[PDB]
Write a protein that holds these residues in place. Structure first.
Motif, short mmCIF file in Angstrom:
data_model
loop_
_atom_site.label_atom_id
_atom_site.label_comp_id
_atom_site.label_asym_id
_atom_site.label_seq_id
_atom_site.Cartn_x
_atom_site.Cartn_y
_atom_site.Cartn_z
N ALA A 273 0.57 -1.22 -0.16
CA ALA A 273 -0.08 0.26 -0.06
C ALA A 273 0.84 1.87 0.28
O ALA A 273 0.63 1.81 -0.60
CB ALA A 273 -0.69 -0.23 1.05
N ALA A 274 2.62 1.38 0.49
CA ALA A 274 3.26 2.26 0.76
C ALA A 274 3.37 3.05 0.04
O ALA A 274 4.31 3.83 -0.96
CB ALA A 274 4.13 1.93 1.99
N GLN A 275 3.90 1.76 -1.14
CA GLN A 275 4.37 2.18 -2.58
C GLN A 275 3.56 2.83 -3.62
O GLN A 275 3.57 3.61 -4.39
CB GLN A 275 4.28 0.78 -3.80
CG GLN A 275 5.52 0.06 -3.31
CD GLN A 275 6.85 0.25 -3.41
OE1 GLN A 275 7.31 0.92 -4.42
NE2 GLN A 275 7.54 0.96 -2.27
N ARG A 276 2.27 2.66 -3.23
CA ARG A 276 1.29 3.80 -3.86
C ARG A 276 0.98 5.64 -3.11
O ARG A 276 -0.01 6.15 -4.16
CB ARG A 276 -0.41 3.29 -3.67
N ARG A 277 1.84 5.41 -2.37
CA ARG A 277 1.34 7.10 -1.44
C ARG A 277 2.98 7.58 -1.80
O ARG A 277 4.01 7.14 -1.89
CB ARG A 277 1.46 6.79 0.13
CG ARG A 277 -0.31 5.62 -0.23
CD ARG A 277 -0.03 5.70 1.89
NE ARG A 277 -0.02 6.76 2.11
CZ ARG A 277 -1.40 7.44 2.29
NH1 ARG A 277 -2.18 6.80 2.96
NH2 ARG A 277 -1.45 8.74 3.27
N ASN A 278 2.31 8.79 -1.96
CA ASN A 278 4.60 9.91 -2.32
C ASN A 278 4.55 10.47 -0.52
O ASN A 278 5.76 10.25 -1.12
CB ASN A 278 3.58 10.80 -3.38
CG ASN A 278 4.21 10.15 -4.99
OD1 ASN A 278 4.32 9.62 -5.10
ND2 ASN A 278 3.20 11.30 -5.30
N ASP A 279 3.42 10.39 -0.03
CA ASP A 279 4.13 10.27 1.26
C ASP A 279 4.22 9.65 2.56
O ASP A 279 5.27 10.45 3.62
CB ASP A 279 2.55 11.56 2.09
CG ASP A 279 1.76 10.63 2.27
OD1 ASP A 279 2.14 9.39 1.50
OD2 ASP A 279 0.54 10.76 3.19
N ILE A 280 5.00 8.83 1.85
CA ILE A 280 5.35 7.80 2.65
C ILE A 280 6.28 6.87 2.27
O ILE A 280 5.55 6.40 1.28
CB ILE A 280 4.11 6.99 3.42
CG1 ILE A 280 3.30 7.64 4.35
CG2 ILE A 280 4.77 5.35 4.50
CD1 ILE A 280 2.29 7.33 5.28
N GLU A 281 7.34 7.32 2.81
CA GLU A 281 8.24 5.82 2.46
C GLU A 281 8.72 4.89 3.28
O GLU A 281 8.83 5.37 4.14
CB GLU A 281 9.25 6.26 0.97
CG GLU A 281 10.42 6.97 1.59
CD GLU A 281 11.54 7.14 0.74
OE1 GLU A 281 11.74 6.75 0.13
OE2 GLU A 281 11.39 8.32 1.09
N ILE A 282 8.50 3.62 2.78
CA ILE A 282 9.76 2.48 3.52
C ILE A 282 10.86 2.58 3.21
O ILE A 282 11.39 2.10 2.40
CB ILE A 282 8.85 0.79 3.23
CG1 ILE A 282 7.57 1.20 3.29
CG2 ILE A 282 9.37 -0.29 3.74
CD1 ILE A 282 7.16 1.60 4.63
#
Ligand SMILES: NC(=O)c1ccc[n+]([C@@H]2O[C@H](COP(=O)([O-])OP(=O)(O)OC[C@H]3O[C@@H](n4cnc5c(N)ncnc54)[C@H](O)[C@@H]3O)[C@@H](O)[C@H]2O)c1
Ligand SMILES: NC(=O)c1ccc[n+]([C@@H]2O[C@H](COP(=O)([O-])OP(=O)(O)OC[C@H]3O[C@@H](n4cnc5c(N)ncnc54)[C@H](O)[C@@H]3O)[C@@H](O)[C@H]2O)c1
Ligand SMILES: NC(=O)c1ccc[n+]([C@@H]2O[C@H](COP(=O)([O-])OP(=O)(O)OC[C@H]3O[C@@H](n4cnc5c(N)ncnc54)[C@H](O)[C@@H]3O)[C@@H](O)[C@H]2O)c1
Ligand SMILES: NC(=O)c1ccc[n+]([C@@H]2O[C@H](COP(=O)([O-])OP(=O)(O)OC[C@H]3O[C@@H](n4cnc5c(N)ncnc54)[C@H](O)[C@@H]3O)[C@@H](O)[C@H]2O)c1
Ligand SMILES: [Mg+2]
Ligand SMILES: [Mg+2]
Ligand SMILES: [Mg+2]
Lengths: 331, 330, 331, 331
Positions: C20-29
């Protein structure tokens, strides 16, 4: 040139064929026949337990199906002779009811005005069978053809690579097969297949299959040299071929793999795949290949006796090749 | 000894047949389905859910021979042609799932049988019965219904609660095992779209008139109960989940004591009481129609409670079909 | 401005959170910790029985995970105190081992250099719990929080609409829940949950849950007004809430549906969904909503006593909201 | 004359061995060790998802298990060296934890006062393995033995008949195997077996197995002439061997069947069975035979190349033969 196609039998194969046709510019499904209202037919297309939601627009307008802006005739004719395919100018019919696997039944589509028919199963008679990548160039303009079975489409490309490179003396195949529509949720009636009537979720269920023997027709030099059987097991989709084969010329396991990899990148590109990872069946769900070689799963006894493993999505692979065959026989 | 014919040798038909072997007051003398005798023998001998048949089975001359006794095997699609009189049948177990009304089930009587038990809820005004709850209301009717498996689980529970504390209102869920009407993979079910979806892949919601029918079984609860179902991928055994409001206050311990008392008294052999960490397969083969799970349920307060009761939807129902046959011929 | 996140526990939640985080710009693992080699972690990310192949490239370079060309630190520390989160400048840790559900255990991430921690399960102690869309605005800058449970994230939004619009007198909940990792393939040891040790595929398995009671904490006005239990059934993913509730003000089933539908289009958009179709559990697989109301599945006895059905992908919905909560607590 | 037996590891094999022991006069289970309270052990014995309710009386009295009038010591020693088997005069220990498959570990039972040990799995070292009916007479009074694997116990009696009667040139085996306790309900960690970590209910899962190669030790003349692999499928119990074999002397399928039938009635009676019916896996559930030949399922390509099918209840058959081995090594 766009091929106009009708589907008879909007089941697992019919519906998966339908979705795959949507991603092709050279094929348009313009008519569907089953025993369903248009609105139920729409629902079966939209929601799929195995392959997820349909990526596209579906509406029902005045008893016709409208998919991605295209009107699709919906009919409920039990007798294919009454299908009036000519009224929607259908070129080729996908015969996927599972009921009409011979010339005398399938030709009724041509009687109903279609030009050609692809039967989505093995022939009951001498209707020629084809496996894309193996014997499709032997097509001679026949009006009625068969795309063989899902299992034959998995075994034949594998068998071809081995037979071409090393030669096959003889082989015995087992397919471990996902549950299909012919099976039962709990022990129920299957008068012509007693084992197949037993509850699918509860059992490993042995079955006969002519799929390995049928490879003898697809690859004539292998006639009488292959046969096998099946175990039906409780998964919803994806199956696997387990081929135990004796080779004419010696080959190490690495050499077999190199040969399969090469064919997968060359002549059998888009048909035979090569995997060298720790996969399991669901990793193959949605794969349009008809044969996916599992390098790590198989094992050699010696240089002339080897067990080879190849996966296949029995719905998706077969269905894409039905469309490949339509494009081929109309080219 | 009541001579019985079975129409529809399916899950219920066959589990009834097995249960009858363990009754001294009933004999199965004819079976009708769409099967040859040898296939019919095979379906009886081997059972994925209940194991090997506990008897001798063989085929002799187009007849089924079970424990040394001969049984007529026929394949009449139309019940009117069954000629039950030719094997002197008293009562027919109607378990095809196709004939759930007086006009269709009465064809067995046209064909020479005296009485008919329909193994599903009536489509028309055919009276339904639940053994231990309203079987004494039977008035000699020639055609009756044994209601549904779910109703047979819910009604005994509802009776105990209603008698002791009174029920204001209740909503039921049954978490139900897969059945023969369902599909292995997404397939056609025009009158039940959800039920056509692959059984093994899904939790499948369903309507059921099973809680509402308890209103017919227990008239004082008419309009006070309804519910629905979730079909889940198990082969057998189901569970009732009843959320009920009580008229008079009761602690959870008090509810349990009432159910336990009933299970030892008036509802012995119908309603059971379990106080253990059980799961569904522990109920497989149990002939009770309602098995109360004391530890699984929970009270919000003294008037609002969730109660759990198991049922082997094949075995419990099937045994009570035989109990209903004995009762209506008594 | 981009929040740098570490994951402790690359299990079902950790890995679905990662996707899910891959499709967000505001959060990166930028870091993952488990008890696995880097190459095994890559394999577990790439292939997923429930959610299919990873949509992207995964590779290992020098003991690091490389996802679409970006490097991600991989460690194998059993004790969270040794994680050195400061060395890759992690802001927030996703604590999804299932082992550290308290302030005492989770704060070790802060000892290890992280600023905040989101625990992906209900708190064992007084660590504040949140459900996006229901009580997230009560967050007060706490360093350690919990996103409650999957079941609570399904029930609370539904309960909120009913409570706000009509008021809830009392309610009893059942969740029919998919199999999870704590369960067993065949009857095995589960000393603190005997029922839960029995074979998952063979059984409907009753279970206790504090999820309905916990909604009393999320929505304080409902304290002591809700409780319930669970049945664990043999599906791999997607669960459903079955809420039996008594209402203060009378409401027809249509009025209840209209209220839920309005909330799904307004205040609870992207949290609560509204479905008016013949769906089954697999149709909900992959849906990022935490509560999907099934209008056709439920039933009213009368205007004050009603049974409501709401679906939830217990892996995907919860995981997306973990990320929504991370974005919120850092705003 | 009565052999006093202790069980270490009250798992699937331990509990099924236990029940089988109740119906033998020559064997008494007098002690059980696991990591469980006595009342939980009682519960695990009483209720079984696969084999139904225990038929006997079970009670807990002062921390001891009382079953059918006999007292059974219950202990919780993680280290077998501390089991004090001598205090209850144990002759043979059933070692079924799955953790102690070598001489160094299993010998701890002898340190703890037992005279002999049967390991319920294939040996990791040179500990001698046995298959009842095939090589049990080669037993030479050793204190520590192995009963091989369930799969080896299915293959070896089948292979013995074929090798004796017709001679085996070479063979490759597949076992289609029920799910076991080592597998996972959903995709989870399995560092030494990546495929085996994938969700069991969702997948056909390939696996390596040395069971076919191990038959080379059981039947020395077949060393290097057999190997194979496995597919794990989502059923709770009962497995099947699929043997593809080349024969030295020619045999019709009828001749193969008659030879197997003869052995099943003679020398291998009670070990190898013969079935000539349309059975499926659940029909074999509870059968104490270690190999059940399925005449109708198999198929010949020709008189020297054949595929043979044999079923086995992997819990029950193996467990019964463990007791047969105990009776044999103590005679
Ligand atoms: N499922 C697979 O993996 C697979 C693979 C290869 C080949 N096949 C073959 O494809 C054919 C269909 O397979 P399927 O899995 O899609 O079965 P299916 O049961 O899912 O589909 C059959 C469809 O035909 C409809 N139908 C039935 N009678 C009809 C009639 N008189 N006229 C029009 N429609 C009718 C049915 O309503 C149904 O929807 C079979 O021959 C099968 O052996 C299946
Ligand atoms: N399975 C349960 O748990 C359960 C419980 C209670 C009640 N019921 C009800 O009992 C009835 C039967 O249910 P089932 O589960 O046994 O279904 P089933 O499909 O297993 O059995 C139906 C049998 O009837 C046969 N049959 C079909 N048409 C026939 C005809 N014209 N004449 C004679 N035989 C015919 C079928 O071949 C089949 O064997 C249904 O009404 C069902 O709702 C089922
Ligand atoms: N699966 C769901 O539907 C769901 C939904 C909401 C909340 N949760 C909760 O989230 C948490 C995780 O659940 P899950 O389903 O992902 O379980 P899981 O078993 O799939 O994942 C746990 C992971 O943590 C790893 N791990 C174990 N010990 C570790 C340690 N000391 N250090 C680092 N890593 C370690 C494990 O190897 C494993 O991969 C639980 O608290 C669960 O109740 C689960
Ligand atoms: N299940 C089969 O079909 C089968 C067949 C043949 C052989 N085997 C083998 O038998 C062995 C056990 O198999 P299983 O299926 O019964 O596994 P299982 O997980 O069901 O049983 C293992 C038991 O040992 C207990 N245990 C774990 N650690 C222990 C310790 N230190 N001390 C004492 N007890 C401990 C566990 O609590 C558990 O109950 C394995 O080696 C297996 O390969 C299994
Ligand atoms: Mg197109
Ligand atoms: Mg990102
Ligand atoms: Mg004994």
């Amino acid at each position: 040139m766009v091929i106009r196609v009708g589907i008879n039998g909007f089941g697992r194969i019919g519906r998966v064929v339908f979705r795959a046709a949507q991603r092709r510019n050279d094929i348009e499904i313009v008519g569907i026949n089953d025993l369903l209202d248009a609105d139920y037919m729409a629902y079966m297309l939209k929601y799929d337990s195995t392959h997820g939601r349909f990526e596209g627009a579906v509406e029902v307008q005045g008893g016709a199906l409208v998919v991605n802006g295209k009107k699709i005739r919906v009919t409920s004719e039990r007798d294919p002779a009454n299908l009036k395919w000519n009224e929607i100018n259908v070129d080729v019919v996908v015969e996927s009811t599972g009921l009409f696997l011979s010339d005398d039944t399938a030709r009724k589509h041509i009687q109903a005005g279609a030009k050609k028919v692809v039967i989505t199963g093995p022939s009951k008679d001498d209707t020629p069978m084809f496996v894309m990548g193996v014997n499709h160039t032997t097509y001679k303009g026949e009006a009625i053809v068969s795309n063989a079975s899902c299992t034959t489409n998995c075994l034949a490309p594998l068998a071809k690579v081995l037979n071409d490179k090393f030669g096959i003396v003889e082989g015995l195949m087992t397919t471990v097969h996902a549950t299909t529509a012919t099976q039962k949720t709990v022990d129920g009636p299957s008068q012509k297949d007693w084992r197949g009537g037993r509850g699918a979720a509860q059992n490993i269920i042995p079955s006969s299959t002519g799929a390995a023997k049928a490879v003898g027709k697809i690859i004539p030099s292998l006639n009488g040299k292959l046969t096998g059987m099946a175990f039906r097991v409780p998964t919803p989709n994806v199956s696997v071929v387990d081929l135990t084969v004796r080779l004419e010329r010696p080959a190490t396991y690495k050499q077999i793999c190199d040969a399969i990899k090469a064919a997968s990148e060359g002549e059998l590109k888009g048909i035979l795949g090569y995997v060298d990872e720790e996969i399991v069946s669901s990793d193959i769900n949605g794969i349009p290949l008809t044969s996916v070689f599992d390098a790590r799963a198989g094992i050699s006894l010696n240089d002339n006796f080897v067990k080879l493993v190849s996966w296949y999505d029995n719905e998706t692979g077969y269905s894409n090749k039905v469309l490949d065959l339509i494009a081929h026989i109309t080219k």
